[PDB]
């Protein structure tokens, strides 16, 4: 049967980034990490097995992997080494990823738009847009 996550499954490569340095600043990422992370051109690999969704980010900077069930909180060590409590839900057809730590919160939304997978990262007033195409 078809599932709303089907439109995300596959291998995706980063094709454009907007305001990513500013977003990382707002999150609290250090200078050196921002420079090395901002150079990266990651692939994102999304797969599903039953109710478990796995999202990998793979680049010369870091390889990360999260597996989760929609709506069930999990612990995540981010690529910038924050230990956060994450919950990922479906809002319509948008995957909405909330990361919480030290009384703060950031929201990463992943949506399909034409043949692209668009990632919007928001911290306080700061929005970064990262666009991926199929790899």
Q: In units of Å, what resolution does this entry have? A: 1.4
* 51 burial level (CB within 10 Å; 0-12, 13-18, 19+): exposed
Q: Contact 117/124 with Cβ under 8 angstroms?
A: no
Edge-first strand order for the sheet with 52-58 is 63-68, 52-58, 43-49, 10-18, 126-134, 116-123, 104-113, 94-101, 83-91, 74-77
Experimental technique behind these coordinates: X-ray
27 marked as binding residue = no
Tell me how far apart the alpha carbons of residues 7 and 2 are, in angstroms, rounded to a whole number.
10
H/E stretch holding 80 reads none
Nearest CA to 9 out of 41, 55, 64, 42 is that of: 55
Q: Contact 108/116 with Cβ under 8 angstroms?
A: no
- Residue 22, domain extent: 1-135
Helix 20-27, helix 31-39: angle, nearest 10: 150
The total domain count for the chain is: 1
134 marked as binding residue = no
**Alpha helices for 28-92 (secondary structure H):** 31-39
Cα 50 from chain centroid (whole Å): 21
């Amino acid at each position: 049967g078809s599932h709303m996550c089907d439109a995300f499954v596959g291998t995706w490569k980063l094709v454009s980034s907007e305001n990513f340095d500013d977003y990382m600043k707002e999150v609290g990422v250090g200078f050196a990490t921002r420079k090395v992370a901002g150079m990266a051109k990651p692939n994102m690999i999304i797969s599903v097995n039953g109710d478990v969704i796995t999202i990998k980010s793979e680049s010369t900077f870091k390889n990360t992997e999260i597996s989760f069930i929609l709506g069930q909180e999990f612990d995540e060590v981010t690529a910038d080494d924050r230990k956060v409590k994450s919950t990922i839900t479906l809002d319509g057809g948008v995957l909405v990823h909330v990361q919480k730590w030290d009384g703060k919160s950031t929201t990463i939304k992943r949506k399909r738009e034409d043949d692209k997978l668009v990632v919007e990262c928001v911290m306080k007033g700061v929005t970064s847009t990262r666009v991926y195409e199929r790899a």
